[PDB]
Design a protein around this ligand. Structure first.
Ligand code: HEM
Ligand SMILES: CC1(C)[C@@H]2CC[C@@]1(C)C(=O)C2
Ligand SMILES: [K+]
Length: 405
Protein backbone atom coordinates (compact mmCIF):
# COMPACT_ATOMS: atom_id res chain seq x y z
CA UNK A 1 0.00 0.00 0.00
CA UNK A 2 1.17 3.55 0.77
CA UNK A 3 3.68 4.29 3.49
CA UNK A 4 3.09 7.37 5.71
CA UNK A 5 4.80 10.41 4.16
CA UNK A 6 8.08 11.21 6.06
CA UNK A 7 8.04 14.65 7.70
CA UNK A 8 10.83 15.98 5.39
CA UNK A 9 9.09 15.12 2.11
CA UNK A 10 6.90 17.86 0.57
CA UNK A 11 3.59 16.94 -1.02
CA UNK A 12 4.53 18.49 -4.37
CA UNK A 13 7.22 15.84 -4.87
CA UNK A 14 4.93 12.88 -4.26
CA UNK A 15 4.33 10.59 -7.27
CA UNK A 16 3.18 7.11 -6.16
CA UNK A 17 5.00 4.98 -8.74
CA UNK A 18 5.07 1.25 -7.97
CA UNK A 19 8.24 -0.32 -9.43
CA UNK A 20 6.77 -3.82 -8.99
CA UNK A 21 3.43 -3.04 -10.69
CA UNK A 22 3.51 0.30 -12.51
CA UNK A 23 0.09 1.65 -13.42
CA UNK A 24 0.81 1.93 -17.16
CA UNK A 25 2.25 -1.59 -17.46
CA UNK A 26 -0.17 -2.63 -20.25
CA UNK A 27 1.57 -0.14 -22.58
CA UNK A 28 4.91 -1.94 -22.21
CA UNK A 29 7.17 -1.79 -19.17
CA UNK A 30 9.58 0.81 -20.54
CA UNK A 31 6.56 2.95 -21.46
CA UNK A 32 5.23 2.38 -17.94
CA UNK A 33 8.42 3.70 -16.37
CA UNK A 34 8.60 6.54 -18.93
CA UNK A 35 5.54 8.14 -17.29
CA UNK A 36 8.13 9.45 -14.82
CA UNK A 37 9.52 11.58 -17.67
CA UNK A 38 6.28 13.37 -18.62
CA UNK A 39 6.69 17.19 -18.62
CA UNK A 40 4.90 17.86 -15.30
CA UNK A 41 6.95 15.31 -13.29
CA UNK A 42 9.94 16.71 -11.33
CA UNK A 43 13.49 15.34 -11.85
CA UNK A 44 13.36 13.77 -8.38
CA UNK A 45 10.13 12.45 -6.84
CA UNK A 46 9.08 10.51 -3.73
CA UNK A 47 6.84 7.47 -3.98
CA UNK A 48 4.94 6.14 -0.99
CA UNK A 49 4.89 2.68 -2.61
CA UNK A 50 7.12 -0.18 -1.48
CA UNK A 51 7.87 1.40 1.92
CA UNK A 52 8.59 4.87 0.53
CA UNK A 53 11.62 5.97 -1.48
CA UNK A 54 12.97 8.63 -3.84
CA UNK A 55 13.17 8.10 -7.60
CA UNK A 56 15.58 9.95 -9.89
CA UNK A 57 13.75 10.29 -13.19
CA UNK A 58 16.37 11.76 -15.51
CA UNK A 59 19.71 10.56 -16.92
CA UNK A 60 21.66 13.45 -15.48
CA UNK A 61 20.62 12.73 -11.86
CA UNK A 62 20.85 8.96 -12.29
CA UNK A 63 24.45 9.25 -13.57
CA UNK A 64 25.46 11.74 -10.87
CA UNK A 65 24.14 9.59 -8.04
CA UNK A 66 25.81 6.41 -9.43
CA UNK A 67 29.16 8.28 -9.53
CA UNK A 68 28.76 9.65 -6.01
CA UNK A 69 29.18 6.56 -3.82
CA UNK A 70 30.10 8.70 -0.81
CA UNK A 71 26.53 10.04 -0.55
CA UNK A 72 24.73 7.22 -2.38
CA UNK A 73 25.85 3.90 -0.94
CA UNK A 74 25.41 0.41 -2.43
CA UNK A 75 25.00 -1.09 1.05
CA UNK A 76 21.22 -1.19 0.66
CA UNK A 77 20.74 -1.37 -3.08
CA UNK A 78 17.29 -2.97 -3.40
CA UNK A 79 13.86 -1.55 -2.67
CA UNK A 80 12.00 -2.46 -0.47
CA UNK A 81 14.24 -1.74 2.54
CA UNK A 82 14.07 -5.28 3.98
CA UNK A 83 15.39 -6.62 0.64
CA UNK A 84 18.20 -4.05 0.42
CA UNK A 85 19.19 -4.73 4.04
CA UNK A 86 19.28 -8.53 3.46
CA UNK A 87 21.07 -8.15 0.10
CA UNK A 88 24.76 -8.94 0.59
CA UNK A 89 26.04 -10.08 -2.77
CA UNK A 90 29.59 -9.13 -3.78
CA UNK A 91 30.58 -6.76 -5.30
CA UNK A 92 27.11 -5.23 -5.64
CA UNK A 93 26.51 -4.51 -1.88
CA UNK A 94 29.92 -2.85 -1.44
CA UNK A 95 31.21 0.66 -2.02
CA UNK A 96 34.72 1.57 -3.03
CA UNK A 97 37.29 1.17 -1.70
CA UNK A 98 36.45 -2.38 -0.64
CA UNK A 99 34.31 -3.22 -3.65
CA UNK A 100 37.23 -2.93 -6.07
CA UNK A 101 39.36 -5.96 -5.09
CA UNK A 102 36.42 -8.29 -5.83
CA UNK A 103 36.01 -7.11 -9.47
CA UNK A 104 39.18 -8.75 -10.79
CA UNK A 105 38.05 -12.10 -9.49
CA UNK A 106 34.58 -11.67 -10.98
CA UNK A 107 36.34 -10.66 -14.23
CA UNK A 108 38.22 -13.96 -14.23
CA UNK A 109 35.03 -15.89 -14.45
CA UNK A 110 32.73 -13.77 -16.61
CA UNK A 111 35.00 -11.25 -18.36
CA UNK A 112 36.26 -10.91 -21.96
CA UNK A 113 38.88 -13.73 -21.85
CA UNK A 114 36.21 -16.20 -20.68
CA UNK A 115 33.73 -14.93 -23.29
CA UNK A 116 36.31 -15.06 -26.08
CA UNK A 117 36.78 -18.77 -25.34
CA UNK A 118 33.07 -19.38 -24.77
CA UNK A 119 32.79 -18.58 -28.44
CA UNK A 120 32.25 -21.81 -30.40
CA UNK A 121 29.89 -23.14 -27.70
CA UNK A 122 27.65 -20.04 -27.54
CA UNK A 123 27.51 -20.13 -31.37
CA UNK A 124 26.77 -23.88 -31.49
CA UNK A 125 23.98 -23.74 -28.90
CA UNK A 126 22.25 -20.74 -30.54
CA UNK A 127 22.28 -22.55 -33.89
CA UNK A 128 21.09 -25.85 -32.44
CA UNK A 129 18.20 -24.35 -30.47
CA UNK A 130 17.04 -22.23 -33.38
CA UNK A 131 17.33 -25.03 -35.95
CA UNK A 132 15.20 -27.25 -33.72
CA UNK A 133 12.47 -24.56 -33.61
CA UNK A 134 12.66 -23.50 -37.28
CA UNK A 135 10.53 -26.26 -38.87
CA UNK A 136 7.79 -25.91 -36.20
CA UNK A 137 6.56 -22.53 -37.49
CA UNK A 138 5.92 -21.46 -33.88
CA UNK A 139 7.47 -21.24 -30.42
CA UNK A 140 6.98 -19.89 -26.96
CA UNK A 141 10.08 -17.72 -27.16
CA UNK A 142 10.55 -17.14 -23.43
CA UNK A 143 10.77 -20.84 -22.54
CA UNK A 144 12.02 -22.17 -25.87
CA UNK A 145 15.02 -19.87 -26.32
CA UNK A 146 15.27 -16.77 -24.09
CA UNK A 147 15.66 -18.96 -21.01
CA UNK A 148 17.62 -22.07 -22.19
CA UNK A 149 20.16 -20.24 -24.36
CA UNK A 150 21.76 -17.92 -21.76
CA UNK A 151 20.93 -20.22 -18.86
CA UNK A 152 22.68 -23.25 -20.41
CA UNK A 153 25.73 -21.13 -21.27
CA UNK A 154 25.80 -20.05 -17.61
CA UNK A 155 25.25 -23.51 -16.08
CA UNK A 156 28.06 -24.85 -18.28
CA UNK A 157 30.39 -21.98 -17.26
CA UNK A 158 29.49 -22.63 -13.58
CA UNK A 159 29.68 -26.44 -13.80
CA UNK A 160 26.12 -26.80 -12.50
CA UNK A 161 23.68 -29.45 -13.75
CA UNK A 162 20.94 -28.36 -16.13
CA UNK A 163 18.32 -30.26 -14.10
CA UNK A 164 18.84 -27.65 -11.32
CA UNK A 165 17.62 -24.81 -13.56
CA UNK A 166 13.92 -24.82 -12.56
CA UNK A 167 14.78 -24.42 -8.86
CA UNK A 168 17.50 -21.82 -9.34
CA UNK A 169 15.47 -19.78 -11.85
CA UNK A 170 12.52 -19.72 -9.49
CA UNK A 171 14.73 -18.44 -6.62
CA UNK A 172 16.43 -15.83 -8.79
CA UNK A 173 13.07 -14.54 -9.95
CA UNK A 174 11.88 -14.14 -6.33
CA UNK A 175 14.72 -11.66 -5.80
CA UNK A 176 13.87 -9.48 -8.81
CA UNK A 177 10.13 -9.96 -9.41
CA UNK A 178 8.77 -11.65 -6.24
CA UNK A 179 5.41 -13.48 -6.57
CA UNK A 180 4.85 -13.00 -2.82
CA UNK A 181 5.55 -16.57 -1.71
CA UNK A 182 9.11 -15.74 -0.50
CA UNK A 183 10.73 -12.64 0.96
CA UNK A 184 14.01 -11.56 -0.64
CA UNK A 185 15.78 -12.85 2.51
CA UNK A 186 14.16 -16.30 2.12
CA UNK A 187 15.04 -16.52 -1.58
CA UNK A 188 18.62 -15.46 -0.90
CA UNK A 189 18.98 -18.00 1.96
CA UNK A 190 17.65 -20.73 -0.34
CA UNK A 191 20.24 -19.77 -2.98
CA UNK A 192 22.96 -19.86 -0.33
CA UNK A 193 21.63 -23.24 0.90
CA UNK A 194 22.25 -24.54 -2.62
CA UNK A 195 25.67 -22.91 -3.00
CA UNK A 196 27.40 -23.49 0.35
CA UNK A 197 28.08 -27.27 0.02
CA UNK A 198 29.08 -26.84 -3.62
CA UNK A 199 31.61 -24.16 -2.72
CA UNK A 200 33.09 -26.34 0.05
CA UNK A 201 33.20 -29.34 -2.35
CA UNK A 202 35.12 -27.26 -4.92
CA UNK A 203 37.51 -25.77 -2.37
CA UNK A 204 38.37 -29.40 -1.44
CA UNK A 205 38.52 -30.62 -5.06
CA UNK A 206 38.92 -27.59 -7.40
CA UNK A 207 37.79 -27.70 -11.05
CA UNK A 208 38.07 -25.13 -13.85
CA UNK A 209 34.43 -24.01 -13.61
CA UNK A 210 33.42 -20.53 -12.40
CA UNK A 211 32.39 -21.64 -8.91
CA UNK A 212 35.77 -23.37 -8.37
CA UNK A 213 37.63 -20.32 -9.60
CA UNK A 214 35.75 -17.97 -7.26
CA UNK A 215 35.88 -20.40 -4.34
CA UNK A 216 39.67 -20.82 -4.64
CA UNK A 217 40.28 -17.21 -5.62
CA UNK A 218 42.52 -14.52 -4.22
CA UNK A 219 41.50 -10.91 -3.70
CA UNK A 220 44.39 -8.46 -3.74
CA UNK A 221 46.68 -11.29 -2.82
CA UNK A 222 44.86 -12.93 0.13
CA UNK A 223 42.52 -15.97 0.12
CA UNK A 224 38.81 -15.37 -0.44
CA UNK A 225 36.73 -16.60 2.50
CA UNK A 226 33.96 -19.17 2.10
CA UNK A 227 31.44 -16.41 2.99
CA UNK A 228 32.76 -14.00 0.35
CA UNK A 229 32.80 -16.79 -2.27
CA UNK A 230 29.17 -17.55 -1.54
CA UNK A 231 28.20 -13.86 -1.76
CA UNK A 232 29.96 -13.57 -5.15
CA UNK A 233 28.51 -16.80 -6.53
CA UNK A 234 24.95 -15.70 -5.62
CA UNK A 235 25.43 -12.61 -7.78
CA UNK A 236 26.80 -14.66 -10.67
CA UNK A 237 23.72 -16.91 -10.61
CA UNK A 238 21.35 -13.90 -10.75
CA UNK A 239 23.35 -12.42 -13.64
CA UNK A 240 23.34 -15.74 -15.47
CA UNK A 241 19.67 -16.51 -14.95
CA UNK A 242 17.79 -13.21 -14.97
CA UNK A 243 19.38 -10.59 -17.22
CA UNK A 244 20.00 -11.58 -20.87
CA UNK A 245 17.09 -14.02 -20.48
CA UNK A 246 14.68 -11.07 -20.15
CA UNK A 247 16.42 -8.73 -22.58
CA UNK A 248 16.31 -11.27 -25.49
CA UNK A 249 12.51 -11.38 -25.19
CA UNK A 250 12.10 -7.58 -25.35
CA UNK A 251 14.32 -7.55 -28.43
CA UNK A 252 12.56 -10.45 -30.18
CA UNK A 253 9.11 -9.03 -29.42
CA UNK A 254 10.24 -5.76 -31.05
CA UNK A 255 11.58 -7.58 -34.13
CA UNK A 256 8.39 -9.69 -34.39
CA UNK A 257 6.38 -6.43 -34.47
CA UNK A 258 8.70 -4.55 -36.84
CA UNK A 259 9.28 -6.20 -40.25
CA UNK A 260 11.20 -3.14 -41.49
CA UNK A 261 13.78 -3.58 -38.75
CA UNK A 262 14.15 -7.32 -39.51
CA UNK A 263 14.66 -6.44 -43.18
CA UNK A 264 17.31 -3.89 -42.29
CA UNK A 265 19.39 -6.49 -40.40
CA UNK A 266 18.86 -9.21 -43.03
CA UNK A 267 19.97 -6.83 -45.80
CA UNK A 268 22.74 -5.16 -43.78
CA UNK A 269 23.95 -7.81 -41.26
CA UNK A 270 27.01 -5.70 -40.42
CA UNK A 271 24.58 -3.38 -38.60
CA UNK A 272 23.84 -6.11 -36.02
CA UNK A 273 26.34 -4.87 -33.35
CA UNK A 274 24.99 -1.31 -33.62
CA UNK A 275 21.42 -2.68 -33.49
CA UNK A 276 22.33 -4.57 -30.32
CA UNK A 277 23.42 -1.27 -28.72
CA UNK A 278 20.26 0.55 -29.78
CA UNK A 279 18.08 -2.29 -28.46
CA UNK A 280 20.01 -2.20 -25.19
CA UNK A 281 19.10 1.46 -24.94
CA UNK A 282 15.41 1.13 -25.93
CA UNK A 283 14.72 -2.08 -24.00
CA UNK A 284 16.86 -1.32 -20.98
CA UNK A 285 15.51 -3.24 -17.99
CA UNK A 286 17.33 -2.85 -14.66
CA UNK A 287 16.37 -0.54 -11.77
CA UNK A 288 18.61 -0.56 -8.66
CA UNK A 289 18.99 1.92 -5.84
CA UNK A 290 21.28 3.34 -3.23
CA UNK A 291 20.96 4.52 0.39
CA UNK A 292 21.80 7.99 1.70
CA UNK A 293 24.87 7.94 3.95
CA UNK A 294 24.08 11.44 5.26
CA UNK A 295 21.56 14.23 4.99
CA UNK A 296 22.22 15.76 1.59
CA UNK A 297 20.65 18.44 -0.59
CA UNK A 298 20.58 17.08 -4.16
CA UNK A 299 19.19 19.14 -7.04
CA UNK A 300 17.21 21.33 -4.63
CA UNK A 301 15.70 18.41 -2.68
CA UNK A 302 16.49 17.62 0.98
CA UNK A 303 17.40 13.93 1.25
CA UNK A 304 17.76 12.39 4.74
CA UNK A 305 20.39 9.91 6.00
CA UNK A 306 18.99 6.42 5.45
CA UNK A 307 16.49 7.41 2.72
CA UNK A 308 16.55 5.03 -0.21
CA UNK A 309 16.72 6.33 -3.75
CA UNK A 310 15.78 4.29 -6.84
CA UNK A 311 18.13 5.13 -9.71
CA UNK A 312 16.64 3.35 -12.69
CA UNK A 313 19.38 2.34 -15.13
CA UNK A 314 16.48 1.84 -17.52
CA UNK A 315 15.57 5.53 -17.57
CA UNK A 316 18.80 7.29 -18.62
CA UNK A 317 18.65 6.10 -22.26
CA UNK A 318 14.88 6.73 -22.54
CA UNK A 319 15.36 10.37 -21.40
CA UNK A 320 14.69 12.70 -24.37
CA UNK A 321 17.42 14.89 -22.86
CA UNK A 322 19.88 12.06 -23.60
CA UNK A 323 18.38 10.74 -26.89
CA UNK A 324 15.90 12.43 -29.19
CA UNK A 325 12.68 10.53 -30.06
CA UNK A 326 13.71 8.06 -27.37
CA UNK A 327 10.94 5.50 -27.93
CA UNK A 328 11.90 5.27 -31.59
CA UNK A 329 14.34 2.51 -32.53
CA UNK A 330 17.03 3.73 -34.94
CA UNK A 331 19.91 1.38 -35.73
CA UNK A 332 21.73 4.36 -37.33
CA UNK A 333 21.56 6.46 -34.15
CA UNK A 334 24.95 8.24 -33.96
CA UNK A 335 25.33 8.78 -30.22
CA UNK A 336 23.51 5.93 -28.40
CA UNK A 337 23.45 7.18 -24.80
CA UNK A 338 22.46 4.71 -22.04
CA UNK A 339 23.32 3.30 -18.63
CA UNK A 340 21.83 -0.16 -19.34
CA UNK A 341 24.90 -1.91 -17.89
CA UNK A 342 25.11 0.56 -15.00
CA UNK A 343 27.28 3.57 -14.31
CA UNK A 344 30.15 4.41 -11.98
CA UNK A 345 32.29 1.91 -10.14
CA UNK A 346 29.85 -1.04 -10.48
CA UNK A 347 29.72 -1.16 -14.30
CA UNK A 348 28.46 -4.59 -15.37
CA UNK A 349 31.18 -7.22 -15.62
CA UNK A 350 28.98 -9.57 -17.64
CA UNK A 351 28.36 -7.09 -20.46
CA UNK A 352 30.77 -8.73 -22.92
CA UNK A 353 29.07 -12.10 -22.43
CA UNK A 354 25.66 -10.39 -22.72
CA UNK A 355 26.53 -8.63 -26.01
CA UNK A 356 27.89 -11.90 -27.49
CA UNK A 357 24.69 -13.69 -26.55
CA UNK A 358 22.57 -10.88 -28.05
CA UNK A 359 24.53 -10.55 -31.28
CA UNK A 360 24.78 -14.32 -31.85
CA UNK A 361 21.03 -14.58 -31.25
CA UNK A 362 20.16 -11.77 -33.70
CA UNK A 363 22.41 -13.18 -36.43
CA UNK A 364 21.49 -16.86 -36.10
CA UNK A 365 17.77 -16.26 -35.58
CA UNK A 366 17.39 -13.95 -38.63
CA UNK A 367 19.40 -16.42 -40.78
CA UNK A 368 17.00 -19.30 -40.09
CA UNK A 369 13.72 -17.53 -39.28
CA UNK A 370 13.85 -14.15 -41.09
CA UNK A 371 10.07 -13.63 -41.13
CA UNK A 372 8.05 -14.13 -37.96
CA UNK A 373 5.28 -12.41 -36.07
CA UNK A 374 3.35 -12.38 -32.81
CA UNK A 375 0.87 -15.30 -32.63
CA UNK A 376 -2.71 -14.48 -33.69
CA UNK A 377 -4.63 -12.48 -31.07
CA UNK A 378 -1.79 -12.50 -28.51
CA UNK A 379 -1.41 -9.49 -26.19
CA UNK A 380 2.19 -9.44 -24.93
CA UNK A 381 2.33 -8.82 -21.19
CA UNK A 382 5.38 -7.40 -19.44
CA UNK A 383 6.40 -7.63 -15.77
CA UNK A 384 8.24 -5.04 -13.68
CA UNK A 385 10.77 -5.18 -10.83
CA UNK A 386 14.49 -4.85 -10.17
CA UNK A 387 14.85 -6.54 -13.56
CA UNK A 388 11.85 -6.24 -15.89
CA UNK A 389 10.72 -8.91 -18.34
CA UNK A 390 8.21 -10.47 -20.72
CA UNK A 391 5.76 -13.04 -19.34
CA UNK A 392 5.21 -14.95 -22.58
CA UNK A 393 6.10 -14.36 -26.25
CA UNK A 394 4.29 -16.70 -28.64
CA UNK A 395 5.74 -16.35 -32.17
CA UNK A 396 4.61 -17.84 -35.54
CA UNK A 397 6.09 -18.11 -39.02
CA UNK A 398 5.60 -20.16 -42.19
CA UNK A 399 8.18 -22.96 -42.00
CA UNK A 400 7.91 -23.77 -45.72
CA UNK A 401 9.87 -20.66 -46.71
CA UNK A 402 12.66 -21.47 -44.28
CA UNK A 403 15.58 -23.86 -44.65
CA UNK A 404 18.33 -25.47 -42.61
CA UNK A 405 21.84 -23.99 -42.76
C1 HEM B 1 21.46 -7.70 -20.50
C2 HEM B 1 22.27 -8.22 -19.58
C3 HEM B 1 22.74 -7.47 -18.34
C4 HEM B 1 22.41 -6.25 -17.84
C5 HEM B 1 21.41 -5.20 -18.38
C6 HEM B 1 23.21 -6.05 -16.63
C7 HEM B 1 23.18 -4.95 -15.81
C8 HEM B 1 24.03 -4.70 -14.75
C9 HEM B 1 24.04 -3.49 -13.94
C10 HEM B 1 23.08 -2.30 -14.16
C11 HEM B 1 25.00 -3.61 -13.00
C12 HEM B 1 25.41 -2.54 -11.96
C13 HEM B 1 24.50 -2.57 -10.75
C14 HEM B 1 25.07 -1.64 -9.75
O1 HEM B 1 24.80 -0.41 -9.84
O2 HEM B 1 25.77 -2.14 -8.86
C15 HEM B 1 25.63 -4.90 -13.22
C16 HEM B 1 26.66 -5.40 -12.44
C17 HEM B 1 27.17 -6.67 -12.56
N1 HEM B 1 26.81 -7.63 -13.50
FE1 HEM B 1 25.51 -7.34 -15.09
N2 HEM B 1 23.99 -7.17 -16.43
C18 HEM B 1 23.73 -8.07 -17.45
C19 HEM B 1 24.30 -9.31 -17.64
C20 HEM B 1 25.21 -9.89 -16.76
C21 HEM B 1 25.67 -11.24 -16.82
C22 HEM B 1 25.25 -12.21 -17.93
C23 HEM B 1 26.52 -11.44 -15.80
C24 HEM B 1 27.30 -12.72 -15.44
C25 HEM B 1 26.90 -13.93 -15.81
C26 HEM B 1 26.60 -10.19 -15.06
C27 HEM B 1 27.42 -9.97 -13.98
C28 HEM B 1 27.53 -8.80 -13.29
C29 HEM B 1 28.43 -8.62 -12.19
C30 HEM B 1 29.40 -9.68 -11.63
C31 HEM B 1 28.20 -7.23 -11.71
C32 HEM B 1 28.87 -6.59 -10.48
C33 HEM B 1 29.85 -5.47 -10.74
C34 HEM B 1 30.13 -4.77 -9.45
O3 HEM B 1 29.23 -4.69 -8.56
O4 HEM B 1 31.28 -4.27 -9.32
N3 HEM B 1 25.76 -9.27 -15.66
N4 HEM B 1 25.02 -5.56 -14.27
C1 LIG C 1 21.20 -5.31 -10.86
C2 LIG C 1 21.76 -6.58 -11.49
C3 LIG C 1 21.36 -6.70 -12.97
C4 LIG C 1 23.27 -6.62 -11.30
C5 LIG C 1 23.62 -8.02 -11.77
C6 LIG C 1 22.41 -8.87 -11.36
C7 LIG C 1 21.49 -7.86 -10.70
C8 LIG C 1 20.05 -8.33 -10.52
C9 LIG C 1 22.22 -7.52 -9.43
O1 LIG C 1 21.87 -7.94 -8.14
C10 LIG C 1 23.43 -6.70 -9.77
K1 LIG D 1 22.72 -4.98 2.78
Amino acid sequence: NLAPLPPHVPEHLVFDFDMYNPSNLSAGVQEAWAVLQESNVPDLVWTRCNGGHWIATRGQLIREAYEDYRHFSSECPFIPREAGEAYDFIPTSMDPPEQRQFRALANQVVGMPVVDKLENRIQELACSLIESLRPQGQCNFTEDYAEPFPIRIFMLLAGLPEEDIPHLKYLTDQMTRPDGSMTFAEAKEALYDYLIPIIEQRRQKPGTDAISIVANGQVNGRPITSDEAKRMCGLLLVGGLDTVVNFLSFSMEFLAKSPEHRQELIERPERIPAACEELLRRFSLVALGRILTSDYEFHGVQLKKGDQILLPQMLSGLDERENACPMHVDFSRQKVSHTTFGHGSHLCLGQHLARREIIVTLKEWLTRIPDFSIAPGAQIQHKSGIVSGVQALPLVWDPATTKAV
